[PDB]
Amino acid sequence: ITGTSTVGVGRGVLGDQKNINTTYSTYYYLQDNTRGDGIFTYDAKYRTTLPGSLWADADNQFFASYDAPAVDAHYYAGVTYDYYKNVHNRLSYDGNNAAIRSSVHYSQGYNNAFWNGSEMVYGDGDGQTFIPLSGGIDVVAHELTHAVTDYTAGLIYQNESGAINEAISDIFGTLVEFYANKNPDWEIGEDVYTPGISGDSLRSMSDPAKYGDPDHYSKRYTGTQDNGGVHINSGIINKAAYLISQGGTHYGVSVVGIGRDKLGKIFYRALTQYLTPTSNFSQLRAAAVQSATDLYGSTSQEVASVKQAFDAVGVK
Amino acid sequence: ITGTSTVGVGRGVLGDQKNINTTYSTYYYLQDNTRGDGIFTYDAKYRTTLPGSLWADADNQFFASYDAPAVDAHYYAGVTYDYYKNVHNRLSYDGNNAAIRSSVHYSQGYNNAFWNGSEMVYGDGDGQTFIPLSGGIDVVAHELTHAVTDYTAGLIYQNESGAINEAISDIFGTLVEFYANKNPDWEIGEDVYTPGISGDSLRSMSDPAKYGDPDHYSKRYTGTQDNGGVHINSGIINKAAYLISQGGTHYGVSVVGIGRDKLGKIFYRALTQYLTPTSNFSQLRAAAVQSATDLYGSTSQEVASVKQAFDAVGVK
Ligand SMILES: [Ca+2]
Ligand SMILES: [Ca+2]
Ligand SMILES: [Ca+2]
Ligand SMILES: [Ca+2]
Ligand SMILES: [Ca+2]
Ligand SMILES: [Ca+2]
Ligand SMILES: [Ca+2]
Ligand SMILES: [Ca+2]
Ligand SMILES: [Zn+2]
Ligand SMILES: [Zn+2]
């Protein structure tokens, strides 16, 4: 829409109040003109037709319970755009300030959220397994990272390349959660998963085996479900990334942590300059080693820790 | 694009030559202006970013092997639009001549095709399990029918409503295959599935159990895979629709066939006037009975056969 940029106020899924960038033209729309070519949030109104209607509001105040998911989708897309811009000098997901679009209220009782190739889509959850998925900033940044991967490495969504593609989304979703300093942790989806249980999450990067995912290459899943295990075998890489950042001894292999910032720099370089659509784990290892080499020198502690981490999860 | 409407010639996935509606403006584009607001075909160029580039060609002749999938996607979207218009008086999938967009060459070795909420997407197959999926007119009409369902009943994609949603796509994909008289049968996906084996298909409507899907309500799948069995439990409804059309005795229950045309009229009425997002099998039965009642009278043979068919697959 063409109109005047302004700021409205609302409440997110978890009840927290926040300011959001809106556009005024008769109605107030969830359209942020301050980032790139814009961040636009739509109402899919419980249907599956996309993108639905650009979200319109009569008074710029978004405190209705129906508004919540749209507030967070809108807001966390802006924090993720800021992260990529400030930290990695990337403008939007294609590197040229593409507009970011998200639809909320997709379908009925839909327990998922996804980047479909053109925009973000979020279910509201059934209320038991999940609450509206846009309340989790690691979930929003995980899905928006698939858009970055699709424009850069192009990892296909199956077997080891799809596991890499999932792990990269978990790592950067976690790094964005730390960047916003929203109660950060190494878990995925804990703010929106099972409202009735405290302490759990969908997956864990610090201990993937807690929920039964592999934390070692010898335990990878080799069947056909989940497109060859793309959400399952991503634990192996998740654990490698957690070790590089935080350090630890895993199956007897000791890794000195180098921290989150270096972890984000090595993986972002690996992703944007060396990974290809069909990279597999062993080529991710070589890409991360080469990236850390480029940045810190082949005899740095940073190269050393990237090797140890991959040796500790059995990736040669 | 704005330009002059013209006609080009090409070869489809199966090697068959066909005329296609294109638009000329410097290049020749796969843009058909003769149907509704247009049918547009894009090249995703082996990536997952959508929709990719509107397909452009220098001389209006599409005989390159890379062109094949785009020729059939373009062409079979026009036959499906014609079917809905001529047979059911529906203009495009939303009933108001929405433009139909399809992208081909999605990803690498991708064994599937789908309507994503906004457009059609087709993989090229790996060459062993599938060849480019747009070569199968039942596949193209199956996916385009999900767009019709999304704008009308809105069946959610899970458990019995998602099974209904899949079966409705198989039925109308089959009816479109008969309408184009392209070697018609009651099987799904046989022109593009496993190029090395003759005689098989992904699913069968006349005998779903041939590939292990249920043909009776007592055999339905009750677990969680495939969103509660939406591709599996659709066999039950598929078999009911085949019996209503063709007749037969199934688990001892005898059904007089009333033919394809009446089958399409009853189900299209059921779909557009009585089904809701959460309809389950028993409410599909009541919807089909009511529809046949509306059209042929409560004491017709057509109502009688709809009851027998649902009794024969155990749906009360
Ligand atoms: Ca308001
Ligand atoms: Ca957290
Ligand atoms: Ca988290
Ligand atoms: Ca929980
Ligand atoms: Ca040509
Ligand atoms: Ca056929
Ligand atoms: Ca067929
Ligand atoms: Ca075959
Ligand atoms: Zn993901
Ligand atoms: Zn389907």
UniProtKB/Swiss-Prot annotation, chains A, B:
What temperature behavior is annotated for this protein? Thermostable.
The residues listed in the UniProt record as binding Ca(2+) 4, with positions renumbered to this chain, are 193-194, 197, 200
**Cofactor entry:** Ca(2+); Zn(2+)
Which residues span the membrane? none
Chief location of this protein within or outside the cell? secreted
Where, by residue number, does Ca(2+) 1 bind? 57, 59, 61
Instruction: Tell me the cofactor note.
Output: Binds 4 Ca(2+) ions per subunit. Binds 1 zinc ion per subunit.
State what protein this is by name.
Answer: Thermolysin
Species of origin: Bacillus thermoproteolyticus
Q: Which lineage is the organism of this entry classified under, starting from the top rank?
A: Bacteria, Bacillati, Bacillota, Bacilli, Bacillales
